DNA sequence: GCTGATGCGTC
DNA sequence: GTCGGAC
DNA sequence: GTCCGACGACGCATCAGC
C-alpha cells in the first residue's frame, strides 16, 4: 500500500497483490527506489534479475506506459545511444545542487561526499531547506526521468543554473531513499550492480511471466505456474534469447517496448530487424594472455589473425538508395565527423553494392610519410557536425568484418563467408580503406612472429577469430566471440616501471571506506625531484589494496614535500611521504598535457604518463631514488618511435 | 571574445 | 581501456 | 565465461567567469 514498504524480493511476488499502486496509477518513483534497494543488498545477479523482474511485472499489469521510464531509470540512460542525450551533470554541479537544496556549505558536502564514497548518502541525509510544512505529492518513476531528460535538453549560456534549479526541486520532493538514487543517477553512479544484460533478463521473464495486453484484472499473472522447474527455465532461457538477439541488432528500448507491449515477445523478432541506418551492438573481444591461451580456447577450429590496429571503431552503414551513417561502438552517431569517410564511400565499394553494414577501425593516417598515426592524433579530429573542408588528420579505414550485404543479414553467417563476402565486394586503396592485415595458420611460431610484426607495424597486436565454429557474428550468443592478443598481456614483456607513491584518493562506490586511486612519480635526476607520471586504480586485488591502506597509512603528509611536483594532476585526498616504489605495467606511453613527469625532454610543453597502467607488485626491494627516471621515461617513449 | 574548468566520449 | 570479484 | 563496476589518459565541446 505504502510505497516505503513495497518488497519486490518477496517470495511469492504476486504482480497486482504486492504492487504498492493501484491499476491505471503512475509508478511511484519510491517503487523504483524501493526496488533499487533490494538489488543493491544481494551480490547474486539472478537475484537481482527476479526482484527487478518482480517490479516489469507490476509494471506491465498495473501501468503499461511506465514500463519504458522504469526500463531507463534501471539503466540510468536517458533514452536510445545514437539520440546522443546527456545530462551534462556531474559531481560539480550535482554537489552545489546539494548544498543549495540542504543549505549546507559546498566544502562540507563535497568532503562527505569524498569520505562516504557516495553522494546519494550525502543527499539522502540531510533535509531541504526549501520544503515545506506539507510537502509536494510524491515523485513518480515517469515524472523523475522526465526531468532528467528536462536537464539533459538544457544547453546555452545560463544554463547550469537552470539545471540546478530541476535538481534542487527533485531532492525538495525525496522521501525515504529517493534522494540516494536520484543523486547517484545524476553522478553516472547508480551502482546497483544490475546493468544492460540483467535488465534484458527481466524483462524477458517479466513480460513472459506476466504477459502485456490482457484485459483487466489480468487472467494470466504467472505463466509459469503451470510448468515444472524444469520447463519453466528452458521456456524462459529461450524467451530470454528472443529477446537478446533482437536488442544486440535494434538495440534501441523506444523502438522494442511499444512493440513488446502490443504484440508480444514471440514476434518482436517480426517487427524489429538488423537494418543498414539502425546501429546494432559489436562484438567484442576477449583479452588472452598468450599463444597457448588462444589453441586452449579455439581447440581445432581453424582461426585467422588479425592486426588490431590503433584507431577508433567505425560501423559504416550503406543504406538502399545511397544515404551513409557511421556509428561508434556504442550506437553513438558519428556520421558528421566523417565528411571525408562518407565522402570516399562510393570509392571502397563496387557499383554491385547497394546496401552494407561494415565493421572498420578508422586510424590516424600521414599521407605525406603513407603510415598509421598514433590514437593521440586521431582524437584531434573535431567531433559531432563537421564540414569537409575542415579535416586536418586524414583517417585510413581498416576494414575487419562485413554484418550486411545488398539486404541480407550476416549475423548467423560464418566469418569465411561474411570475410570473403567483404574481400570480393570491396575496393582497397592504399592510405583511405585497406582490409585488415590477416594470416590463417596454426603455427604457433608464425603467430608469434605475426605478432611482433604488428606491433613493428604500428598495431596493439593482434585479433584472432574462428572462421567457420562459432563464427557467426550473433551477439546475443557470446558478445566477446574473438579474442584479443597484446604483448603487454605477456607476463615479462612490454615496458613495466618502478614508480614511487606520492598521493592516494579516497575511494568511491566499491572502493568506499578505502583508497580507490594513487598518484604515482618518476624522480627527476637533473633536478632531485618526483614528478607526478599518472594515477592508479587498477591490477590490485583486494587483499592488496586493503594491503596498502595499512602499509601507506603512516606516510600520510598533512602538506606536500617540496620535491614533489605534480602540476595540474588532481591534488591527491592524502599526500604520502615518497617511499613505497611499485611496479606497473603499461601498453604505451603518451604525450600529457597535465603531467610533468619528462616534461622537456621529448617536448618542451608536455610530459609523458601511461596508456592503461596498471598495478603489478611492489618493489619492497627499491626506494625512490631507484625508482624510474624521467630519464629513462624519455627514453622508452621515444623508442615507440 | 577569450580562457579554465568541467562533462562526455573515445581508447 | 585493465583489472578483480561474484556467480 | 559472463557480468559488473572499481579505476586509467586524453582531447573536443561546452559554459561560467571573466
Ligand atoms: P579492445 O581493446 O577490447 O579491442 C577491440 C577493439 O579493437 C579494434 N580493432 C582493431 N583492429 C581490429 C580487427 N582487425 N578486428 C576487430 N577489432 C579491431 C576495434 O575497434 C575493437 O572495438
Same mark, same amino acid.
Given at each position: 500500500n505504502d510505497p516505503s514498504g513495497y518488497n519486490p524480493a518477496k517470495n511469492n511476488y504476486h504482480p497486482v497483490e504486492?504492487?504498492?499502486?493501484?491499476?491505471?496509477?503512475?509508478?511511484?518513483?519510491?517503487?523504483?527506489?524501493?526496488?533499487?534497494?533490494?538489488? %543493491?543488498?544481494? &551480490?547474486?545477479? $539472478? *537475484?537481482? +534479475? %527476479?526482484?527487478? &523482474?518482480?517490479? $516489469? *511485472?507490476? +509494471?506491465?499489469?498495473? &501501468?503499461?506506459?511506465?514500463?519504458?521510464?522504469?526500463?531507463?531509470?534501471?539503466?540510468?540512460?536517458?533514452?536510445?545511444?545514437?539520440?546522443?542525450?546527456?545530462?551534462?551533470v556531474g559531481d560539480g554541479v550535482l554537489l552545489k545542487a546539494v548544498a543549495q537544496a540542504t543549505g549546507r556549505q559546498l566544502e562540507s558536502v563535497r568532503a562527505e561526499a569524498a569520505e562516504k564514497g557516495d553522494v546519494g548518502l550525502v543527499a539522502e541525509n540531510s533535509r531541504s531547506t526549501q520544503r515545506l510544512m506539507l510537502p509536494p505529492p510524491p515523485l513518480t518513476a515517469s515524472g523523475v526521468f522526465s526531468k532528467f531528460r528536462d536537464i539533459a535538453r538544457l544547453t546555452g549560456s545560463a544554463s547550469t543554473a537552470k539545471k540546478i534549479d530541476i535538481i534542487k526541486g527533485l531532492f525538495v520532493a525525496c522521501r525515504h531513499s529517493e534522494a540516494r538514487f536520484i543523486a547517484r543517477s545524476l553522478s553516472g553512479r547508480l551502482r546497483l550492480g544490475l546493468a544492460e544484460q540483467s535488465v534484458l533478463a527481466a524483462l524477458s521473464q517479466a513480460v513472459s511471466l506476466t504477459p502485456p495486453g490482457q484485459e483487466f484484472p489480468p487472467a494470466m499473472v504467472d505463466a509459469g505456474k503451470g510448468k515444472?522447474?524444469?520447463?519453466?527455465?528452458?521456456?524462459?532461457?529461450?524467451?530470454?534469447?528472443?529477446?537478446?538477439?533482437?536488442?544486440?541488432?535494434?538495440?534501441?528500448?523506444?523502438?522494442?517496448?511499444?512493440?513488446?507491449?502490443?504484440?508480444?515477445?514471440e514476434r518482436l523478432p517480426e517487427h524489429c530487424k538488423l537494418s543498414p541506418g539502425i546501429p546494432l551492438k559489436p562484438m567484442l573481444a576477449h583479452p588472452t594472455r598468450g599463444i597457448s591461451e588462444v589453441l586452449k580456447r579455439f581447440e581445432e577450429a581453424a582461426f585467422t589473425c588479425e592486426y588490431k590496429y590503433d584507431g577508433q571503431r567505425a560501423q559504416i552503414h550503406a543504406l538502399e538508395g545511397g544515404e551513409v551513417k557511421i556509428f561508434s561502438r556504442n550506437q553513438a552517431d558519428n556520421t558528421g565527423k566523417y565528411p571525408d569517410i562518407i565522402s570516399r564511400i562510393p570509392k571502397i565499394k563496387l557499383p554491385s553494392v547497394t546496401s552494407f553494414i561494415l565493421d572498420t577501425e578508422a586510424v590516424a593516417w600521414d599521407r605525406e610519410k603513407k603510415q598509421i598515426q598514433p590514437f593521440q592524433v586521431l582524437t584531434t579530429r573535431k567531433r559531432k557536425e563537421v564540414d569537409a573542408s575542415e579535416i586536418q588528420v586524414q583517417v585510413c579505414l581498416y576494414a575487419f568484418d562485413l554484418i550486411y550485404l545488398n539486404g541480407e543479414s550476416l549475423v548467423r553467417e560464418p566469418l569465411s563467408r561474411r570475410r570473403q563476402l567483404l574481400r570480393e565486394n570491396f575496393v582497397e586503396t592504399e592510405g583511405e580503406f585497406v582490409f585488415a592485415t590477416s594470416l590463417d595458420t596454426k603455427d604457433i611460431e608464425q603467430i608469434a612472429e605475426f605478432l611482433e610484426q604488428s606491433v613493428k607495424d604500428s598495431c596493439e597486436g593482434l585479433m584472432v577469430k574462428t572462421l567457420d565454429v562459432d563464427a557467426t557474428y550473433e551477439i546475443a550468443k557470446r558478445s566477446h566471440n574473438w579474442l584479443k592478443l597484446k604483448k603487454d598481456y605477456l607476463d615479462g614483456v612490454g615496458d613495466t616501471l618502478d614508480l614511487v607513491v606520492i598521493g592516494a584518493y579516497l575511494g568511491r562506490?566499491?572502493?568506499?571506506?578505502?583508497?580507490?586511486?594513487?598518484?604515482?612519480?618518476?624522480?627527476?635526476?637533473?633536478?632531485?625531484?618526483?614528478?607526478?607520471?599518472?594515477?592508479?586504480?587498477?591490477?590490485?586485488?583486494?587483499?592488496?589494496?586493503?594491503?596498502?591502506?595499512?602499509?601507506?597509512?603512516?606516510?600520510?603528509?598533512?602538506?606536500?614535500?617540496?620535491?614533489?611536483?605534480?602540476?595540474?594532476?588532481?591534488?591527491?585526498?592524502?599526500?604520502?611521504?615518497?617511499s613505497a616504489v611499485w611496479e606497473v605495467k603499461c601498453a604505451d606511453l603518451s604525450l600529457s598535457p597535465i603531467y610533468p613527469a619528462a616534461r622537456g625532454l621529448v617536448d618542451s610543453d608536455k610530459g609523458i604518463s601511461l596508456r592503461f597502467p596498471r598495478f603489478i607488485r611492489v618493489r619492497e626491494d627499491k626506494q625512490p631514488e631507484q625508482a624510474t627516471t624521467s630519464a629513462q621515461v624519455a627514453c622508452l617513449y621515444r623508442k615507440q618511435s
Open positions: 504486492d504492487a504498492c499502486w493501484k491499476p491505471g496509477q503512475k509508478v511511484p518513483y519510491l517503487a523504483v527506489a524501493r526496488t533499487f534497494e533490494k538489488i %543493491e543488498e544481494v &551480490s547474486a545477479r $539472478l *537475484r537481482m +534479475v %527476479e526482484t527487478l &523482474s518482480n517490479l $516489469l *511485472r507490476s +509494471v506491465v499489469a498495473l &501501468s503499461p506506459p511506465d514500463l519504458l521510464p522504469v526500463l531507463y531509470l534501471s539503466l540510468n540512460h536517458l533514452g536510445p545511444p545514437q539520440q546522443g542525450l546527456a545530462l551534462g515444472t522447474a524444469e520447463a519453466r527455465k528452458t521456456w524462459l532461457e529461450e524467451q530470454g534469447m528472443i529477446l537478446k538477439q533482437t536488442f544486440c541488432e535494434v538495440p534501441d528500448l523506444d523502438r522494442i517496448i511499444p512493440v513488446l507491449l502490443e504484440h508480444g515477445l562506490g566499491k572502493r568506499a571506506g578505502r583508497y580507490g586511486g594513487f598518484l604515482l612519480a618518476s624522480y627527476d635526476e637533473d633536478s632531485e625531484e618526483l614528478q607526478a607520471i599518472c594515477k592508479l586504480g587498477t591490477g590490485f586485488s583486494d587483499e592488496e589494496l586493503e594491503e596498502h591502506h595499512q602499509s601507506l597509512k603512516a606516510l600520510v603528509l598533512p602538506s606536500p614535500r617540496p620535491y614533489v611536483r605534480i602540476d595540474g594532476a588532481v591534488i591527491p585526498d592524502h599526500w604520502l611521504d615518497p
